[PDB]
Design a protein around this ligand. Sequence first.
Ligand SMILES: *C(=O)/C=C\c1ccc(O)cc1
Length: 125
Amino acid sequence: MEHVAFGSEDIENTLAKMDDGQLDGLAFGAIQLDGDGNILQYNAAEGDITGRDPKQVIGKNFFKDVAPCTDSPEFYGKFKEGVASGNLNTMFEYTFDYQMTPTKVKVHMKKALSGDSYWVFVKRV
Ligand SMILES: *C(=O)/C=C\c1ccc(O)cc1
């Protein structure tokens, strides 16, 4: 178990040191995306929420392929503006509903310390 709290103010510093098998110890879902929304990392806790096998989603586009209910101004729209701006730190609730039981979650999106990477953190509410 890796001790990190959802929403912590220096979470990107914390996760920088972590390997993929370390990300799997987090109490919340964590996805790492490039600027184009392609999944670079995907932890086990997100797999528990969405039903995806984490290995099978790496390389796919989060907005186009994997999570199409996120393709909207309220989610994808924010990300695309954070990528354009190169700054992003936003937290909001959303309902995941694509090919799964509708589940209400808290999403936190934040820029990584990495130069062109972005985090999406997901926990149940
Ligand atoms: C809407 O599509 C949000 C999330 C999501 C993530 C994974 C899967 O498989 C479905 C939906």
